[PDB]
Amino acid sequence: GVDLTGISKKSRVIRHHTYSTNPYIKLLIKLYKFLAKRTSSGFNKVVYQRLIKSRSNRAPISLSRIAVVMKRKAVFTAKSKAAPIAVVVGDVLDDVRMARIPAMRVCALRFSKSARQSIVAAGGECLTFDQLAMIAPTGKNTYLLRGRKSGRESVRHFGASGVPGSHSKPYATNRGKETKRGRRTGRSYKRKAFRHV
């Protein structure tokens, strides 16, 4: 026998195949598993890992965030060079708060219809991942992008709301209930807004 105390602690849970039933996601996973094995690109590797991920972990992105980050990159980029292709393994959603966007090349798993319309009407084009594999087989001159997940309602509800320094939302159907003892100084006590970590 060999002393391996809690060696099971070092094993890590990693998705190695997709739970998706979508046949086209499976075709894309085939393509990019081949590209990640047979090329030196880090872009292909990360695209493959994201392709096998769960939908919750492929957060959607807004068109406005894409435009803003592409602008921050466009300055300090030589005006000789062309703008990178923005790549998101996920969904692109339209944004009503940004009417005026530049011509952008975007590759996404899916576009919302209004997002696709806005991108095209601004002069850009909507790509799929097979076209991207055709014209950027190693992901040269690309901008890999992720959507936001920290504003999610589930994230806002995580953790006990009655411990000092917590500001999580409680699981409650009635907003007016649970506004008393424990939340006001005049009702016995109030849970502290701040605690030093």
Partner 1 sequence: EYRGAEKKLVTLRRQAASHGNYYLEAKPKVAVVTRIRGIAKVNPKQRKILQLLRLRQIFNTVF
Partner 2 sequence: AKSKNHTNHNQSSKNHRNGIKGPVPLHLHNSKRGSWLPALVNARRVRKHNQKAALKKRRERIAAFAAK
List of residues contacting partner 2 (CB under 8 A): 6, 9, 75-76, 194, 196-197
Could you give the string, one character per residue 2-21, with x where binding to RNA holds by CB under 7 A and - elsewhere?
x-x--xx-xxx-x-xx----
C-alpha distances (whole Å) from 139 to each of 85, 172, 195 are: 9, 46, 45
Q: Looking at residues 145 to 174 of the shown chain, list those that interact with RNA (rule: CB under 7 A).
A: 158-159
Residue 14 binding result from RNA, partner 2, partner 1, none, given CB thresholds of 5 to 8 Å by partner type: RNA
User: Could you list the residues that contact partner 1 (CB under 8 A)?
Assistant: 1-5
Q: Is the dihedral of CA 60, 68, 150, 153 positive or negative?
A: negative
Identity of the amino acid at 28: L
Q: Considering the complex, what minimum distance in angstroms separates the CB of residue 84 from RNA?
A: 26
Min. distance of Cβ 196 from partner 2 in angstroms? 6
- Is the distance from CB of 73 to CB of 143 less than 8 angstroms? yes
Q: Tokens standing for 106?
A: 């975007």
User: What is residue 85's three-state secondary structure?
Assistant: strand
The tokens of 13 are what?
Answer: 């849970």
The residues of the shown chain that bind RNA, judged by CB under 7 A, are 1-2, 4, 7-8, 10-12, 14, 16-17, 29-30, 33-34, 37-38, 158-159
